[PDB]
Amino acid sequence: MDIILGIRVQDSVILASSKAVTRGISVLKDSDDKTRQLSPHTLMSFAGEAGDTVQFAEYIQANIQLYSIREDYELSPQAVSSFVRQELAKSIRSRRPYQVNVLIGGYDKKKNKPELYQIDYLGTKVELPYGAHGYSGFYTFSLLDHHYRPDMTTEEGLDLLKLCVQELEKRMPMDFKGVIVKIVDKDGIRQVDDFQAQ
Amino acid sequence: MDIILGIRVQDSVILASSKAVTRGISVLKDSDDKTRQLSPHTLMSFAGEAGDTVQFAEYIQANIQLYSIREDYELSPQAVSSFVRQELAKSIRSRRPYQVNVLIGGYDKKKNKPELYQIDYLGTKVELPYGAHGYSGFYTFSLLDHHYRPDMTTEEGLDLLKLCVQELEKRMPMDFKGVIVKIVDKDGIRQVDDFQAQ
Amino acid sequence: TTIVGVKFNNGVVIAADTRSTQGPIVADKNCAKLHRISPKIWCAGAGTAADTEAVTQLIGSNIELHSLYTSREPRVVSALQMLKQHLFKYQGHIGAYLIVAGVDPTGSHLFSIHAHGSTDVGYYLSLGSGSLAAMAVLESHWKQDLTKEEAIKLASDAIQAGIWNDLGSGSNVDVCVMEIGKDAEYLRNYLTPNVREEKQKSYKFPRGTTAVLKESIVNICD
Amino acid sequence: TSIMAVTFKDGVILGADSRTTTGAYIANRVTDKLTRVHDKIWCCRSGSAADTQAIADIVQYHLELYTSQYGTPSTETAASVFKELCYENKDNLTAGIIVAGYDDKNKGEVYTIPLGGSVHKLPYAIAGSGSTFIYGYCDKNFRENMSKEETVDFIKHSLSQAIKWDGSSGGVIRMVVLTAAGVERLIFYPDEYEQL
Amino acid sequence: TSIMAVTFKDGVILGADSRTTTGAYIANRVTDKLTRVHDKIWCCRSGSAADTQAIADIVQYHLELYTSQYGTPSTETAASVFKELCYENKDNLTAGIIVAGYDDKNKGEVYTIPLGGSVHKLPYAIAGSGSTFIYGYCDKNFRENMSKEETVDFIKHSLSQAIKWDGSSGGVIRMVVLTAAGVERLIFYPDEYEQL
Amino acid sequence: QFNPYGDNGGTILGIAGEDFAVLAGDTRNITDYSINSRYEPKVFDCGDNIVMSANGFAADGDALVKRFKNSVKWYHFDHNDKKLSINSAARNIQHLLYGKRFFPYYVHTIIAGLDEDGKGAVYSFDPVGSYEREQCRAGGAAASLIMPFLDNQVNFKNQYEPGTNGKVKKPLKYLSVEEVIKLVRDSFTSATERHIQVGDGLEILIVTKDGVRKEFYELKRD
Amino acid sequence: TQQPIVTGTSVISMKYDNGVIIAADNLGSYGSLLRFNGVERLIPVGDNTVVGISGDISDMQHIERLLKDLVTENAYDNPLADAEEALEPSYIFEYLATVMYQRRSKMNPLWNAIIVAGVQSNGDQFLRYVNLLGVTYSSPTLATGFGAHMANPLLRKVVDRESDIPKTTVQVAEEAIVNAMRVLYYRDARSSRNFSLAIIDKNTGLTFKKNLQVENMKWDFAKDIKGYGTQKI
Amino acid sequence: TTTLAFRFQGGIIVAVDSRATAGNWVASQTVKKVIEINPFLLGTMAGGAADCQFWETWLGSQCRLHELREKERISVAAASKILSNLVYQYKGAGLSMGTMICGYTRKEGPTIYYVDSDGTRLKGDIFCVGSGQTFAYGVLDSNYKWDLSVEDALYLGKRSILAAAHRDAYSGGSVNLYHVTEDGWIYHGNHDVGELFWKVKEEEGSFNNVIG
Amino acid sequence: SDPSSINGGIVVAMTGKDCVAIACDLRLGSQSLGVSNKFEKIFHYGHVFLGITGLATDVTTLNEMFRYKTNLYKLKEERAIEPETFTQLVSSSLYERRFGPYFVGPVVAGINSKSGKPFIAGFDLIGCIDEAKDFIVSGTASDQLFGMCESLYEPNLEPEDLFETISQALLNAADRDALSGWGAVVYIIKKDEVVKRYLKMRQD
Amino acid sequence: GYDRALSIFSPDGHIFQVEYALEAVKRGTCAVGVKGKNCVVLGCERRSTLKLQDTRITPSKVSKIDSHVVLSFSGLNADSRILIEKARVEAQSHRLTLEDPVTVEYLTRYVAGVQQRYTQSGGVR
């Protein structure tokens, strides 16, 4: 599968997502951004079935933006993830389920704390310090189980991810073409344009 | 599959073979040499079924060396490839066939001409200017159909391969971990230790 | 499971063992398999437990409403007809196999229903994995014009054959007697021939044996 | 199962064994396969017990409502309702039904509705797993306009043979005589027909 | 196919229809199913024609070599050779064989070797697809020690019924009478037995 | 199609003491939901102070035990009546089992005796020869119900020294033959309560430097 | 690997104070066709053993030939063939069990369920079972096929455990066996009314009764039963 | 199962877990997944319990026969090939094994060979084999240096198997450590995860998720 | 494939002297991959406790469903739902999805506020109620739990004692199951107070 | 099929076929080998019963078994070919399974074994 990683440090949540989009024998694109901003402080990454993936991300984005406008308020990260979980949980028992896994990284301005939610296509949600979807988790959970620390700074988090991406670029069979990294904190969502060699 | 490429220029045959050995979710080795020297002027590269691959290569090597000692002579490239083809052709109709594809690059000291033979596990043999096994061929045959020239020098051949490897490292889904390049000419077989950035 | 139905001179009786199992594991060593459709119409089921139980309560609910609407006592043939038409509709997907018995203004009745919706009438019946052991007994001792006492014995002996010889059955025997002129009498654990012997030792652990990482009080009040 | 219906001088007679099996196990050894859908219109069932019972119950319902509005139905009409149910629902049904009835105008009649849902009027009909064994016997011994005693004998011998060779048939032999005189139920135990 | 062998007062008689089909097509309407493995030891074949012919040919070979060394073989011995072949090769064979022979000491005898390769000595035997339809008829009409004329009649009626209900049976009825007097071949055409 | 394997139920248990060892097993033999026998020995004395039980498909268990007993016999014939040590028996069993690696003896086997130092020893095997020496082991139908219990009561798993803040583990003092027989009996009465293939009887074989002794206890027959 | 064609149903047995009793009906089924009726499924070996066989009949006949050969072969160069060296029930069983397991091990089973009943030379009763898988077991009562489900429950009410053996007489036992055969005739659709029964007593020897018939059957209550639920006539 | 072996400045480190399973059933927590072929040869086991145990014990007998015959310790290359060639004879029959043959010889120096039932035979410096392999690779790969001290190397190997025992449902029990120098292998104990985890957590401050 | 073996997990309830205990492990994995060691499976509505094993998404969904129903129930009835009543509510809610069931193994534990009587019950995925007086088990290590409970259990244990028994039952059963464990939490319930303790256990 | 015991013991304890085999060696052209401190030299003599040969093609007396080992002999030429071929095959097989060429003692031990075997196998001299 594609690489979808997330790590929650002291005051931010960082999401790293592979850039490759491959079909059969060809890597069609190497600059794919597997993410959608749901609200100024909530970001969602996704991996899964070819078309379902974006259709789901955009459908969720549309709903959150609608709520924001209607209520002139921003739902908390926990609120948004519960909404996403329910959508997936409905889907799994529908005619053709959405085959999409997501990571929701958000900064809760009311609690002043970053939050990372991992949710699979079945609607299985869990809140974690770090998470991953696909085969990635098989090399990153133990890596992070070892190197991760609660009080880490955003900069330490990025170095921690770099350690993850290097492990993946070493042992994973596929060429996922690097990752796009985004930070979610009290000031919003920004993209680290320099990870191709940080 | 693994990448097995071969190109015959003016006075040599160059073979390029991927270095990765992957099983399931893990790249177990990144310095694998998918080649066996059959005689001072004949080299064979191979790709295919996990264990059959080397067992076949070494079995062929053992036989050629035996012939060399018995006859105190070196079989021509064409002779060795016909021997290899027959072995594969027998195998395809046996209890458990060897699932191995090979490229045989040799320099015929009697004719003073390089020769490249492509042979699949069915015992299908053909002599070519350039050849490939696996999905590689799908991007390299047309590339070479365009850039290849008969009278090319060994150095031009290497630049031509570099063009091939770059295309493969761009569009192929798998990370084959680069290639090991070997040149076969009137002076024998030598390995280009500097291709990681030529 | 072993369930049986036996008609006697002035009524009908049903019995069943009390073993509930999930695969080869005994989940409930003393469940009650005898269900009530109405005060005097009792039922015993085998097969998908949730199904026998649900189908019994559904028809039971409608039988009550029908009784209130017609101002008449519920009839066994009504429970039979409603159960069978329901089961038939679900083409056997509702795995309920039942033995329904009871007394009503028209007399005493004994019927069997199968998951696909077919019904049978008889003087003695058995269903469940213990079906064959019980029937061997019934075919060996049943006779026409049994007395309430003989019936209780015959039915009780039938469940025992199942308890002892069938791995899908065991523990106790539950009975329910329905006599034409009286109230139905449910005899829970009418027999208890399988009491676990006193254990050889007590495994009460010395307090402190279990390592605890964190503790706290839980708020129940609002 | 072994079932048959035979028309004769005074009307028609239905007969059947009483065995119902689930595999090699006899779930009921005294089953009553002679089913009444109207006073003088009965049927013998074969195939899925759940199916034939559901069919019979619906037919009975239709004939009861028919009677209420247009009076007593002809045996042909009863066979028609069975047919409609069996044909229209052939994909989800496994029912072989023999309809037999006594009319004052038409006397005794027999209609057989096999698996497909087609209808066949006949002097007599046999069905059920045990029937294959008596095609020869019945064909050689059947005569039209037999007497009640002769018909009861023909059926008793035919079925005793069916019970003899077919493990799915057995128990007692039940019969229902349908004539202007009314309805008569007959039963014959093993110890009698086993030695014919 | 409808085949049978019946022992009687003077020996034994084998009878059979003459129809061989491949699907609903009649490949041969005048087949000869009465097969000779020895002078007075014949057999009726059912199942795979290729198989029963291969079996018969081998048995004949064995009885011929047996005779050469130990004289005329008993019908029991012939049934034994068939059995050995059918039992030992049950996985690759589909053959139902009825063996019938006349011995001077043992008179007429009948052995039936069904699908599994088991052997059964009987007063008479019936086999083939068409036989299911005459179990009742034969059971009711068979008597021991019948006369040649009675036996030929029993067989002619039984088979005409089998041919009547079974589409796989038909054509003419062939018979082989085996007695101390010798071997007699009989044939009966449709226009005769069809109206019995 | 033909299935060369069947499941005869049963449960076996082996515990090793400091200078003794026990191998126990219920005496019930089943097929599906029927009982074939309430008393069919499943634990055997194979000579040279070794007890063994091959539980699972009984025909395979019998063939194995029979083959091993004959193995011991020949060991004597070929090595001047030398005694077959438990460790040597274990390796031997491994080869017997692995010999049928492509058509396995469908059994879980356990053997018990004393090692060459007189200490109690238990060895359990995988259907194809995988084996290990252990302190205790449950095999058969109720293995999943009993092993946990043994890890707790025989090897004191998850148990700590009260008041040590779960810092000091409960010491591994060792069990006496009397304390072991209690754990065994309790294990089987528990197994008999929750597993339908366990019951009828319990037969224990105790091995010491003085040989093999046998004790028998009744179990619930339902 | 094969599939049974002509088959024999239940074989039931039990042991009493002085010996063992074993019975089996005389039917040879062909699917649901009750095809053959004079089939003896009880095979006496010598005068201290009777082997009851169920399952495929062609294989049963094969096991018969094997048993006759065992007798012939045991007689060879054996001056004590009818004395100290005659075939014991245990020898006959161990033999058959060996064959049954070898055959299932070659994936070509003798499709049968077998019960060997007899009295050992020392007077001990012998009752052991072996089937197509080579599985074997002993019990005071043993039955195959349907009889396992319906006969054992009845027979065990007479001898529930070993200690009930000495307290059981031939009369009680034979009665239990005969009743069980009737029950099987009621519920087993592959059973026959005719059957054989044999007794191997350590004093009276081997008694082999042929042509028995199930008698005293209750069918009268059938007349009262009509319809399948609501029908009244 | 999780097994690893890696080469470094001080020789070879071999670490394995000790859990045996039968599906989701924990069959054992005390199995030995390392076999001591001889004073300088170790073999690791993963895959089928019986297959590994049986064939690696057999391998030992073959290595011993070599020494009697050639009056010389067998090489790691030749030992690994005996197993590799044996297994290849059975290709297609269903054998299941992921193995590592690790040893020392004056002629080869510290050597590691990966050998599996597919017939694959690979020489290398680092290998992790088993259902938990990736978990071990995660920790091991991101802390490995050729210049680790025997002490640090021994710990990484131990910490890597610990990582795997924690995240892999099919790995656990205890950790068995080994160190290989030209004087042979040196056993470095059996470390129960039951205690090793909490100790490592406290002392290292890692496994920060789990609440303690 | 098997919805009940994807995530793993166990729950067990026991009755004691004027008390009840309900415990569960904390694991949440995806086949061999352990994913979360903080996934609790016990929830409560007023004084009624519910543990749920099986497919995690359904565990979460069912809890939100019962919180929702017990909330409305309280608003209408004007009292908190009792254990016996809730058990019926769970049963009918499960059976209502008879042909598209939630893949769970629910367990109810509590003390009837009016009778003070301890109560526990289990259910199969379609609602069949298992009402044992001693203990109820559920999850991937249910066989092991049945073994431990049948052996370790004895009537009328005092809270402090029932705690040791329930904990040892859970702990040792979980250690023989690859998909259970990774932490555990135990609830000791009494008419007046409820104590919640996190146990220390193997982390492999 | 042919398995007559050709090499058997005689009363004095000799095996004449092996003894006569040596006589065939004594009759063969001479061969010698001497080892230096850093080499080994092999010398052979050349018969002259008939001289008019083509030295280019006529099979030489010293044969390479592998690139680091040679073999010379005295005796029946036809026989020597058989031993040399088997040696060459064993050399390649050894490299294939041991991943190392044969030692000179190993290769010698192999040739010797083949010779011994032909002294106690039926049907062969």
Swiss-Prot record, chains A, B:
PROSITE patterns, sorted: PROTEASOME_BETA_1, PROTEASOME_BETA_2
SUPFAM superfamilies, A to Z: N-terminal nucleophile aminohydrolases (Ntn hydrolases)
Modified residues (Phosphoserine): 76
Cellular location(s): Cytoplasm; Nucleus
Chief place where the protein resides: cytoplasm
BP terms from Gene Ontology: proteasomal ubiquitin-independent protein catabolic process; proteasome-mediated ubiquitin-dependent protein catabolic process
Function: Non-catalytic component of the proteasome which degrades poly-ubiquitinated proteins in the cytoplasm and in the nucleus. It is essential for the regulated turnover of proteins and for the removal of misfolded proteins. The proteasome is a multicatalytic proteinase complex that is characterized by its ability to cleave peptides with Arg, Phe, Tyr, Leu, and Glu adjacent to the leaving group at neutral or slightly basic pH. It has an ATP-dependent proteolytic activity. This subunit has a chymotrypsin-like activity.
PANTHER family attached to this UniProt entry: METALLOPROTEASE TLDD, PROTEASOME SUBUNIT BETA TYPE-1
Complex and partners: The 26S proteasome consists of a 20S proteasome core and two 19S regulatory subunits. The 20S proteasome core is composed of 28 subunits that are arranged in four stacked rings, resulting in a barrel-shaped structure. The two end rings are each formed by seven alpha subunits, and the two central rings are each formed by seven beta subunits. The catalytic chamber with the active sites is on the inside of the barrel.
Gene this protein is translated from: PRE1
Curated annotation (Swiss-Prot), chains D, E:
Pfam family, one: Proteasome
Main localization (coarse): cytoplasm
Top-level lineage group: Eukaryota
UniProt keyword annotation of Chloroplast present: no
Catalytic activity: Cleavage of peptide bonds with very broad specificity
GO biological process: proteasomal ubiquitin-independent protein catabolic process; proteasome-mediated ubiquitin-dependent protein catabolic process
Family listed: Belongs to the peptidase T1B family.
Protein name: Proteasome subunit beta type-1
Gene: PRE3
Swiss-Prot record, chain G:
CDD domains: proteasome_beta_type_4
Pfam families, A to Z: Proteasome
One GO CC annotation: nucleus
Xref: InterPro entries: Ntn_hydrolases_N, Proteasome_beta4, Proteasome_bsu_CS, Proteasome_sua/b, Proteasome_suB-type
Location in or out of the cell: Cytoplasm; Nucleus
Main location, first listed in the record: cytoplasm
GO biological process, one term: proteasomal ubiquitin-independent protein catabolic process
Annotated keywords: Cytoplasm, Nucleus, Proteasome
Keyword Oxidoreductase (UniProt): no
Domain of life assignment: Eukaryota
Membership in a protein family: Belongs to the peptidase T1B family.
Function: Non-catalytic component of the proteasome which degrades poly-ubiquitinated proteins in the cytoplasm and in the nucleus. It is essential for the regulated turnover of proteins and for the removal of misfolded proteins. The proteasome is a multicatalytic proteinase complex that is characterized by its ability to cleave peptides with Arg, Phe, Tyr, Leu, and Glu adjacent to the leaving group at neutral or slightly basic pH. It has an ATP-dependent proteolytic activity. PRE3 and PRE4 are necessary for the peptidyl-glutamyl-peptide-hydrolyzing activity.
Note: Present with 16900 molecules/cell in log phase SD medium.
This protein's name: Proteasome subunit beta type-7
Organism (species): Saccharomyces cerevisiae (strain ATCC 204508 / S288c)
Phylogenetic lineage: Eukaryota, Fungi, Dikarya, Ascomycota, Saccharomycotina
Curated annotation (Swiss-Prot), chain I:
GO biological process per UniProt: proteasomal ubiquitin-independent protein catabolic process; proteasome-mediated ubiquitin-dependent protein catabolic process
InterPro entries (alphabetical): Ntn_hydrolases_N, Proteasome_beta_3, Proteasome_bsu_CS, Proteasome_sua/b, Proteasome_suB-type
Cellular-component GO terms for this entry: cytosol; nucleus; proteasome complex; proteasome core complex, beta-subunit complex
A Gene Ontology molecular function term of the record: endopeptidase activator activity
Keywords: Cytoplasm, Isopeptide bond, Nucleus, Phosphoprotein, Proteasome, Ubl conjugation
Sequence intervals crossing the membrane: none
Residues with PTM Phosphoserine: 30
Signal peptide location: none
Chain positions of cross-link Glycyl lysine isopeptide (Lys-Gly) (interchain with G-Cter in ubiquitin): 69
Localization per Swiss-Prot or TrEMBL: Cytoplasm; Nucleus
Record bears the keyword Ubl conjugation: yes
Presence of keyword Transport: no
Known partners and oligomeric status: The 26S proteasome consists of a 20S proteasome core and two 19S regulatory subunits. The 20S proteasome core is composed of 28 subunits that are arranged in four stacked rings, resulting in a barrel-shaped structure. The two end rings are each formed by seven alpha subunits, and the two central rings are each formed by seven beta subunits. The catalytic chamber with the active sites is on the inside of the barrel.
Annotated family: Belongs to the peptidase T1B family.
Protein name: Proteasome subunit beta type-3
Organism of provenance: Saccharomyces cerevisiae (strain ATCC 204508 / S288c) (Baker's yeast)
Gene name for this UniProt entry: PUP3
